[model samples]
Target: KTVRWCAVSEHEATKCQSFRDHMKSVIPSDGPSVACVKKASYLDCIRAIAANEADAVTLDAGLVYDAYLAPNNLKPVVAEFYGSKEDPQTFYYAVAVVKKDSGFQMNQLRGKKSCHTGLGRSAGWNIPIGLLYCDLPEPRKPLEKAVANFFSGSCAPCADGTDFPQLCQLCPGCGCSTLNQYFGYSGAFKCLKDGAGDVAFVKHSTIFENLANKADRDQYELLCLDNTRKPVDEYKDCHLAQVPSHTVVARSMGGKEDLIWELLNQAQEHFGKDKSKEFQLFSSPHGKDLLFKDSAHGFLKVPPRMDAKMYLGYEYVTAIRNLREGTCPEAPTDECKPVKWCALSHHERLKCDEWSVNSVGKIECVSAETTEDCIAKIMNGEADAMSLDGGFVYIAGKCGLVPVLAENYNKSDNCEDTPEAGYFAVAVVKKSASDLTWDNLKGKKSCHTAVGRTAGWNIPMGLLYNKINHCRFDEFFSEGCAPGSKKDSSLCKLCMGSGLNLCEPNNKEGYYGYTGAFRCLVEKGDVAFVKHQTVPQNTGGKNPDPWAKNLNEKDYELLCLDGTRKPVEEYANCHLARAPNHAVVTRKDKEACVHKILRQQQHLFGSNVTDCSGNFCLFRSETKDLLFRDDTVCLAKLHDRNTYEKYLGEEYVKAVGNLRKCSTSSLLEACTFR
Candidate 1:
């Protein structure tokens, strides 16, 4: 019987050939072939797979996730065709640009007559818009809804989906005397060249860079998106987000599945390494004349520390007030007053400026919106700390915050060089809330923040909550929290998605934001607040940058309470690092064999994807290991060897042991590997 396989190609004929040739090189035969397609979009590839026109399609990991979500007959495996953003994935599918010399800050470019690659598919269009628009305020949260409403004949003039094009026209040099949006691939770049638009949204890759330089680089400012805002790393552009395994599904092929799996596994080992000229799969030099090359710099990732909390501090506070005031009662609005229980805001966060742990212990709210407001408070000795987003936090430390606190904190007068940390969201838990258990909180009340119309409150919260809740997240908000506010509805969706909520027993004052809320509640005592991912634990005259500090070097404490409050004891789950997670995947056709292999070596592949040359992946050292290091191996004895052997299969476990030994090498070899 003939073995058939199908793949979708987005590249020109010349590019498609490289992939075909490489496949043959790996398989040593024409595994299967389909007619070459044109510059087909990523969606088309997914469509092909879903329609059963192809056994599998190769696309970016992000696209794969989108495709997977589609009701289709396709699955994903092998990371090569869709892997890291640098190699397989395209970063910033669309990069909006101004003249290199144009004095445009990222925020300033918002409402410009932006020339974007036609909004069809690819992560580019989604990323820039998502990071910016989704990062906006509550009323803006309904931007998508409003745009949809306007298009469906619900409203006129300034209707839904109008903000994007409208905002672009409002910006300077955008040349939007009248609204005339055009649609076509690459036309955005052409429009920019014709001097028809103020900003051009192009891909953050080689082709786009060539166009930028040809138009005179010195005349324009390329506004890069920095969502993470980590002092060390800010996303210059957007890329695919991490998703769960796109499991490999069985192709309608016979017995070759095992071989296909082994071959693809071997092929991935070849990834990131250069192939000879004779081979087909060529990587563009990531700008060093190397493979995967692109001239333009991609966006820097917002440090993981800068999630919704970085921008949602103010939103969290306001949402809390709205919940209490009954102002946000679940009505979707296009204005800034969208009734939302969850908010993501950076502007209103200044409200916390005057609100500090007073010397005499008073919690007064300080409504500061500008850096100047923060500066004034610190300079007058009226404030001990100034909280802002990471970008502003870095800026304040460099100028405002440092100057204000210089005279008192440092005796040397050199300004201690210690930065004032940014404030992130840390929702308080109500002491009366009965759902103290994370598992019990499934569909229970909780709070989160979002920025503007671009709400990420549900997205990240859903992700975080799902992992803790041990249940899959629902795509839609089925069990919502409250009814009156859109923001409230969103928070409800997030909590519900993770199986939690945020109502009467969940949002009481003084019971939230207290330290060690999660663990405290678990200790058979009342709980207050659990920290948000982006919340700053030690800011404003306390140990700022708590998570950033070296955990290993510290045997420390932030608060010491003498009955007035219980001590903020060391919580077992307080996170400290930002190590990104990686996956262990195989080709789509190799699901059965690969899954079997994984099961056989179950002890090796833990939550962390360790670096294994060939045989097996390494596992992470759990918390117990942290306490006793490698010597704590005694726990394995309690783990029933018979059961472990039955599950892992003694033969496969032995193979892994051998591979682990082979992986060890001399210091010089180890250094070379690093």
Candidate 2:
């Protein structure tokens, strides 16, 4: 096999030719061959690579971000890092640095002459300026206009001749430094130290790299997001955003990333640094930055999931996104219609209100006391959408509202690329209770996640109801704690509601949710019905609560539908039902719109996201399972199977049908055409 390198210029092609010849004697006979193809520009190289004219090419962070889209379908496999460290650093910090002798705070940046690396680049333009844009006053304008007004005059390259002339005032004539001296990270810093600018927007490594003395470097300090200034070394705590490094991209599919990485690994070992006299892989005598960045110290192979977006990181991407939009997304213009989220409870409404303001009115809140009521509101356009459990998804589906996006929870099988099945609805019994198989499960005390929830009550109850053909769960099982159960019934017999709220249908009850239910099985109950995650999460020191602190995970067994039991680890085969995950539902016409809105919202507020700057968390509630599950990873798009019967598979749908015979929901009872 042969790897064809994409080169941007004649010099790059000439260097590549030398590299190809150098590779001949270096690599083993079985090693892959290398060839070079020249393109007019980096953009053309991207096109050439996508069309299979070449296999790989190195690109700046900005171009790599652009390459992974619109059918170009290239992903970063090899990444570039800088400095003396042999270990790779795929990211750098965008810091706002000012002279320590200056008394002006970050908020006092207005009218100040600033120095920037360039417009649209991470450290120079997007991050430092994007953050400045976040606190703009009521009379908001486009980012370009606002930046022009914010700073009296400054040198930010690339905008040298644009409408915002103030952005180029400090520079002679900035674009890429080929024309202007003050046009890059060093140029911006030189502008700061030379007293031409008050603040320099640059990488954290700037002052340390530029200054020759420790005392000279100590004169500069960093501005924190908290509006405080600290020493430059504290950049980890005070930087604007972590900016991603440049990368080498290959076709998204059939790219032979492995083979390409093999070539780069060998190239780094042979021609890397001063290892070769024949040619230098990362250096160019003819030009600056030819095939690879001259400043980059080494190349490191990227992780599989580190796609273009992931490699750039969320905050950097958000900053770039802000700069591109020029204003916040879905700004509340008269024509703007907010996505109205249906909330089911008081806590959920509070979280929704917080999210509403954070989205800048792109989201609006409408409250209801139950999921069924919210389903009604969504069906008739009273509200747009809300996340629902599998049981509620079935009801909303039954009511003609479709599933917009399914909420993905923490996965069990350890695969990000594999098809996720949500969670496994399973039956857990004590190891000592060997006689308590599915065959003899009748008349035993049980623990449930919550009433109307999938694993705890709905999935297990539906299966038992189907087997015994009855709605009276109290009669089938002797006594159990099912949250939302009636206080007078035996179903609430084992509920340990604290503060005398005895057998309450909420978290107030001790034996309420997966952990609570699992706690019940460990403490008093003979069997527990919960998702496969419950047992592992609450047992064997995973839980530090009073009852579960001393528990062993090995003591629990799973009861399969085949009338046999297996170790808790065998939940994949022993599950009651592989139920559909909780989904966000809306009217069929509004499904796409709701999906788009949530897709954007979750990007800013996902559990894994840190860009909220520690303000609000979407999946995190004032309490558990309110607006969305606290465990939700993200909202995934459906495969055109958005209808209830399609989203919730046949077995779960039929099971939901069996359980709904007992549900008294008004939405399910109504025969509405709309």
Candidate 3:
């Protein structure tokens, strides 16, 4: 089948012609063929998709929502992944910037001059404005009036000026029309730079992008909701919410979705940024990139079953829906409602119950067979939230939960504050065995925290798969003890399961956690896959457990990627990519409520000087950190609200997704829709 792709441009524009030429040249003989359709605008492409005249086109996050409504049964089929190679991500942060001496915080912007990219742009308007009036009273009239009245003057380009003059009051050129000098990202920043507005709402990278020199940026600062200000580059530490990137949409039915994907995959391979500098799919020589981001590294295939709502994420979809409907988005009620928190084990349930009792009727405990079940409950609206490992966080996200908070560990000076302040995945080997390196691990015995666990399985296994391009992991390691693996498989052969539940996902398995994997190394294994802190926390008398009582830090060394050995602390410089910490997962609507209850609960039961003698304990050593991390010092706010892809960097997610394809899991398959 030939895929008809829409090129967004003027009807007779050169961009359209170039896109057609590129698509034709890129299509392989065996791969699907492609035909390009010229659409003057995003809406035209939406109409074309509905009329069966076009099969696919990339649209802004806001426009993606428009394509989802009735009359146009279009849904997102792929998403453009953006960011640096080190921190490649699917989304970016939306932030509000003000002059360093503005003397205004997020709350003090009322009656101030403001600059916005446009009426409906995510970073420019929707996310920032939607959050500003999220709690406003009913009819869109009052909310709209509130914005107009609050900002004495503004430059919100593309707004209906006659009906919303105040919104256009601050824009200088062309009466606040598209031609307005203060219209888009750079334009909005220009509005602030030109002293037309006190504040500029735009993407976090806007300042760095607009001003070429460091001196100019040093004069700007970001406004945090806490009434505080920080340098512009500190956006990750202080900023508004993160928003999804633009997405490519296709008809929900008869869209030849598979063909669309085939064409896209082939197009990217032939004309992608690094593939062909002559005709980059993400670049346009005449003007702005017509169909995709000019800076995009590649396209990530959207899960086939994800509708627009699922693709955009609940919060993003809701924000857009509220904007279109002229209604205030729902805010968490102040009433002390009972939130059902999901627990994966009996011990975790007991701990949750204890915390719930401490909450004094603020929380309720809900039991689930596994993390996957908890995610299903959240999707079904039966559960409110749960803390998850990086592995489960991916599954929960695919199943529709977002990260609300992240568990923070004790750093020497508390320098890292972002939710993404992560830990390193390391391989611990016995120092006496001087014969092992990352390269010669084949046919060796191994120890793991568990199957489907991030540090233990995902990182190491992902690298192994990427290196060898195969999934015969069991063959690579002659035998190994990976808890949660099939009990009868050779992978579980080394597991020292207590006669009860052998090689299970729960505590019954002896080798099933940070300490467990280390124990496997202590008892019987060549190398152990675990977090950087695993060996140190259990050795040198730091741990009083019988097995680790005599353990010494000098006995073990970390395996480096360069096939060298280093002291435990050096895992920072020699290890797999840093993995995001475990986070609190919840439905978008329950975010405020869960954050409130958890904050209050943490105040009472958090890691304080008083220890577990308090009314309730958030962490319990006896439970082996069952529901939460044992070493967690506090729950840090995850600012840049994330979709799973954005929270878990794109490269990491891709590696794990590939690992899963090579070795399928029913749990993952259950959560993954298509």
The residue-level lDDT of candidate 2 at 213 comes to 88
For residues 255-313, could you state the per-residue lDDT of candidate 1 as single tens digits? 23444354444443443244345432324321121111223121111111221112122
Over all chains combined, what TM-score does candidate 1 have? 0.32
The lDDT for every candidate, in the order shown, is 0.30, 0.76, 0.76
Model 2 quality (TM-score): 0.48
Candidate that scores best on TM-score: 3
> How many residue pairs collide in each prediction?
85, 1, 1
**Per-candidate TM vs. native?**
0.32, 0.48, 0.54
On lDDT, the stronger of 1 and 3 is: 3
Summarize candidate 2's per-residue lDDT along 1-674 as a digit string, tens digits. Answer: 78999876576788888889988888887897789997765667889999989999887676676688777989888888876445556677889989997988788888899998776667777777776777776445557667877888889776635677887889855554323557566778889999999999988887876786889889999988888999988999998777677688999978989999999888888888758567887666655456776667778788663457656643455457656776665433334367999876565788789899999878999987556666667765678888888877887776667887887876534222233566899999988766888867789898887678788877888778877877888878898888677667788888888665666545556676677788788777988888887778766776776677888888889998987888999998888888678888887656666767787887777775665457677877522566787677777777756788888887887777666568744445552211
CA deviation > 4 Å runs, candidate 2: 1-25, 28-57, 60-63, 69-74, 81-88, 100-103, 134-142, 145-149, 160-173, 177-184, 190-196, 251-259, 271-300, 303-306, 313-319, 329-674
| Shift in Å, residue 295, candidate 3 | 3.3
lDDT (Cα, tens digit) per residue for candidate 3, span 582-654:
8888887787888877876776777763746644678655527777888888777776756677877777788
Q: lDDT value for candidate 2?
A: 0.76
